């Protein structure tokens, strides 16, 4: 029974290696990674691979791994797929821990924009969780943390992390991670999966997929939002993505909105993440 080696980048940046039978479905690998992680609340997470166009794809747990990675290496990342709007409602502290690690990467990468003060506050909770109580012995006037807190580090940011860290004495790691999440969950781009597209006029927009629905970012001042309940059908055809927007009260007809994606695979990927978010956040 022939087995393929799998390499998974975990959220702490380390590498997990395991073997699965070469005809395995994605769920098989996902279950192995989740067991390694002692993760029970698995519904929020998934595995990502890079396609031949170097695009991030979700590994479909129902489909064969070989029919997804195709010509590429069996290399994956472990990621948050569905960002919970209220992390306090997760049953386990370890779930909240993996969610914090994902968000720290969302912040450092610049996917999740964040004010100076919130970067410093999130940083201070991470430091409290991981080192415990502030100690002056480790931190002089010239201290720079090993921890990555932001897309661009400044001395002023390091200083503010320490000032806030001092305020958190006696805080336990679960408590500090819960405070991290209470702040992160409020950020306007929390759990927003962005897709480059063009509107029906050819104007360049971003489509955001998240818990609260589909967001259209047009020109900073013009941001349209379609709550999942207002979306009856999600479709794609060639390079085009379509949503059916339910009739308003006393309107005779459903309204259709049309977008141009860079290519046919980008249109299918956007369709599938929308359907998955619609299902997930209809049930949650
Ligand atoms: C960890 C991020 N992984 C992702 C994100 C978006 C999509 C899509 N579409 C696939 N994988």
End residue of a domain, out of 137, 168, 189 = 189
User: What's the gap in Å between 203 CA and the centre of ligand 1?
Assistant: 24
Crossing angle of helices 155-167 and 116-131, in 10° steps, is: 60
Looking at the structure, tell me whether residues 262 and 215 fall in a common domain.
yes
137 exposed, middle or buried (CB, 10 Å; 0-12, 13-18, 19+)? exposed
- 3-class SS of residue 110: coil
Looking at the structure, tell me whether residues 98 and 29 fall in a common domain.
no
| Number of domains observed in the structure of the chain | 3
Find tokens 């070989």 and name the residue: 66
Experimental approach: X-ray
Resolution (A): 1.8
Measuring CA to CA, how many Å separate 11 from each of 46, 103, 187?
12, 10, 21
User: What's the gap in Å between 214 CA and the centre of ligand 1?
Assistant: 15
Looking at the structure, tell me whether residues 72 and 166 fall in a common domain.
no
Looking at the structure, tell me whether residues 284 and 253 fall in a common domain.
yes
Q: Contact, 107 vs 190, CB < 8 A?
A: no
Half-sphere exposure of 65 (CA within 13 A, CB side): 25
Measuring CA to CA, how many Å separate 163 from each of 36, 104, 181?
36, 20, 20
Looking at the structure, tell me whether residues 232 and 154 fall in a common domain.
no
CA gap 14, 158 in Å, rounded: 25
Looking at the structure, tell me whether residues 87 and 185 fall in a common domain.
yes
Looking at the structure, tell me whether residues 20 and 95 fall in a common domain.
no
For residue 69, give its domain range: 1-81
User: What's the gap in Å between 223 CA and the centre of ligand 1?
Assistant: 22
Range list of β-strands (E), 134-254:
193-199, 204-210, 213-217, 223-226, 231-237, 240-245
- 3-class SS of residue 216: strand
Looking at the structure, tell me whether residues 195 and 162 fall in a common domain.
no
Looking at the structure, tell me whether residues 67 and 90 fall in a common domain.
no
Looking at the structure, tell me whether residues 77 and 125 fall in a common domain.
no
End residue of a domain, out of 189, 211, 246 = 189
- Residue 220 makes CB contacts below 8 A (sequence gap 6+) with none
Looking at the structure, tell me whether residues 184 and 200 fall in a common domain.
no
User: What's the gap in Å between 62 CA and the centre of ligand 1?
Assistant: 17
Our mutation pick for probing the ligand 1 site, out of 273, 274, 275, 277, counting the most ligand atoms within 8 A of Cβ, is 273
Our mutation pick for probing the ligand 1 site, out of 48, 49, 195, counting the most ligand atoms within 8 A of Cβ, is 48
Kindly calculate the radius of gyration of the chain based on its CA atoms and give it in whole angstroms.
21
Looking at the structure, tell me whether residues 212 and 153 fall in a common domain.
no
End residue of a domain, out of 66, 81, 96 = 81
Question: CB within 6 Å of ligand 1 — which residues?
Answer: 48, 56-58, 79, 193, 269, 273
Crossing angle of helices 93-109 and 116-131, in 10° steps, is: 140
């Amino acid at each position: 029974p022939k087995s393929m080696q799998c390499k998974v980048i975990l959220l702490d940046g380390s590498e997990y290696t395991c073997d699965v039978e070469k005809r395995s479905r994605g769920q098989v690998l996902f279950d192995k990674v989740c067991e390694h992680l002692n993760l029970l609340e698995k519904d929020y997470f998934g595995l990502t691979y890079r396609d031949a166009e170097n695009q991030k794809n979700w590994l479909d747990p129902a489909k064969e791994i070989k029919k997804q990675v195709r010509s590429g290496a069996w290399h994956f990342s472990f990621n948050v797929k569905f960002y919970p709007p209220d992390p306090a409602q997760l049953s386990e502290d370890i779930t909240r821990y993996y969610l914090c690690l994902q968000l720290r990467d969302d912040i450092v990468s610049g996917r999740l924009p964040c004010s100076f003060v919130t970067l410093a506050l999130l940083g201070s909770y991470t430091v409290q969780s991981e080192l415990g109580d502030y100690d002056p012995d480790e931190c002089g006037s010239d201290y720079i943390s090993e921890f990555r807190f932001a897309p661009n580090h400044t001395k002023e940011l390091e200083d503010k992390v320490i000032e806030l860290h001092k305020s958190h004495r006696g805080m336990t790691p679960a408590e500090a991670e819960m405070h991290f999440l209470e702040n992160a969950k409020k950020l306007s781009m929390y759990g927003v999966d962005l897709h480059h597209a063009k509107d029906s006029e050819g104007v360049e927009i971003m489509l955001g997929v998240c818990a609260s629905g589909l967001l259209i970012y047009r020109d900073r001042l013009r941001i349209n939002r379609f709550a999942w309940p207002k979306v009856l059908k999600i479709s794609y055809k060639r390079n085009n993505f379509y949503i059916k927007i339910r009739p308003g009260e006393f309107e005779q007809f459903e309204s259709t909105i049309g977008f141009k994606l860079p290519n046919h695979r980008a249109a299918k990927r956007l369709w599938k993440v929308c359907v998955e978010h619609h299902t997930f956040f209809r049930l949650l």
